[PDB]
Amino acid sequence: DCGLPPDVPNAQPALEGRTSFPEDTVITYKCEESFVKIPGEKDSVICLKGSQWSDIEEFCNRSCEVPTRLNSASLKQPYITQNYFPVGTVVEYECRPGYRREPSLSPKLTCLQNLKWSTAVEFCKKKSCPNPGEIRNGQIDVPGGILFGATISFSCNTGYKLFGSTSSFCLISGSSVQWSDPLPECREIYCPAPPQIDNGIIQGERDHYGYRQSVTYACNKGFTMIGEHSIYCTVNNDEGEWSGPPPECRG
């Protein structure tokens, strides 16, 4: 049997709590922090006859950790599966979903001498959603732009009622940015048909009476009006309600 394996710089043998290794027993060394094993180089020893471990030279070199995860871009091949980032190494990035390349900026990163990657630029910008558009008799609230991940709400002008979603999200869709919900509709809140009064009539009657619109009453010959001569259509909670009671035609 062999005793503990030799000592190797920047590496620590995985003994597994043992002290005595039977012949042929193979022991591998694991590099230390800031150190990654050179590809193709021996990183192991074997206990041979004569209680003699195999030969071995230094096999670890200085390197950067795996590039940090970015929300905008994702590593390309084959860097996406590498771990040995010797100084002076460049990794290439590819815009995520859904982000778009910024021509003027490099999507590559460099492993600096201090085992740190070059501060990443904004090579991958956020994809812009299509213009929310215009809502007839309604409004679009764009709290913070229309970029991917954005949010817009909808409301209706007084007198109109909202029919559909109250909000939309610039969610990721296929190979581009798209709004989660369709542009709703604002429906005119019509009041109930104006009451018909006795001995009177409605001056220039109408088909539909909307918000603020009024109905004017008139008494027939020989009759006298009793009350407010007109009423205006009010709206309360998408509910159309007449200003009040129609006048009265007293004979």
Side-chain angles (χ1 to χ4, degrees):
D1 282 358
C2 300
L4 325 168
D7 217 359
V8 210
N10 312 320
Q12 285 303 6
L15 318 131
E16 264 168 8
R18 318 170 282 169
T19 40
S20 203
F21 321 93
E23 184 187 346
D24 270 359
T25 281
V26 165
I27 273 229
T28 288
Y29 290 75
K30 278 236 131 198
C31 291
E32 267 153 340
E33 254 181 86
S34 298
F35 279 106
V36 168
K37 75 197 204 117
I38 284 98
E41 283 215 27
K42 294 189 351 276
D43 62 359
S44 269
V45 287
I46 191 145
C47 165
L48 331 146
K49 295 193 183 295
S51 161
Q52 174 92 58
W53 289 103
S54 55
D55 247 282
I56 201 175
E57 306 269 337
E58 247 141 294
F59 62 97
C60 301
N61 213 338
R62 332 140 28 62
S63 145
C64 290
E65 273 67 32
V66 200
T68 262
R69 215 203 165 237
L70 302 216
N71 290 319
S72 89
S74 75
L75 245 38
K76 305 238 264 142
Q77 221 51 12
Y79 330 76
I80 210 101
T81 52
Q82 273 156 236
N83 54 113
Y84 176 62
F85 298 124
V87 213
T89 294
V90 301
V91 271
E92 212 188 338
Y93 275 94
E94 64 177 353
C95 285
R96 294 207 180 267
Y99 294 73
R100 85 137 97 277
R101 267 283 287 136
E102 167 69 66
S104 30
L105 301 224
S106 221
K108 303 198 194 73
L109 278 210
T110 270
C111 174
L112 271 26
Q113 239 280 149
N114 89 21
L115 308 200
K116 269 227 243 130
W117 296 103
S118 58
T119 344
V121 285
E122 276 245 79
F123 43 114
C124 285
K125 263 345 258 94
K126 238 145 160 172
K127 270 185 206 118
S128 202
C129 249
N131 189 34
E134 170 91 10
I135 291 184
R136 191 87 213 139
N137 288 310
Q139 267 172 328
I140 318 181
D141 191 299
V142 182
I146 37 185
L147 289 199
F148 162 58
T151 304
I152 73 185
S153 78
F154 315 111
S155 75
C156 291
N157 298 171
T158 286
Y160 301 74
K161 195 195 142 67
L162 211 210
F163 288 127
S165 36
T166 38
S167 56
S168 186
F169 268 71
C170 180
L171 261 29
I172 169 205
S173 130
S175 324
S176 48
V177 290
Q178 275 323 329
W179 295 109
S180 108
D181 311 330
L183 223 36
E185 234 207 287
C186 288
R187 298 229 198 82
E188 181 139 38
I189 299 167
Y190 289 132
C191 260
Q196 262 316 161
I197 44 111
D198 200 12
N199 301 317
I201 63 138
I202 286 158
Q203 277 185 85
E205 174 140 31
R206 247 179 184 57
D207 193 338
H208 268 116
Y209 287 70
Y211 175 63
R212 297 243 241 168
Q213 290 195 302
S214 100
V215 63
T216 298
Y217 283 106
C219 281
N220 300 302
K221 261 251 147 272
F223 290 89
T224 287
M225 172 110 293
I226 296 254
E228 299 258 292
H229 312 234
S230 52
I231 71 190
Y232 323 81
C233 172
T234 81
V235 167
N236 294 112
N237 241 305
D238 337 340
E239 191 82 295
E241 204 191 11
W242 284 112
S243 114
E248 144 211 333
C249 279
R250 201 190 93 299

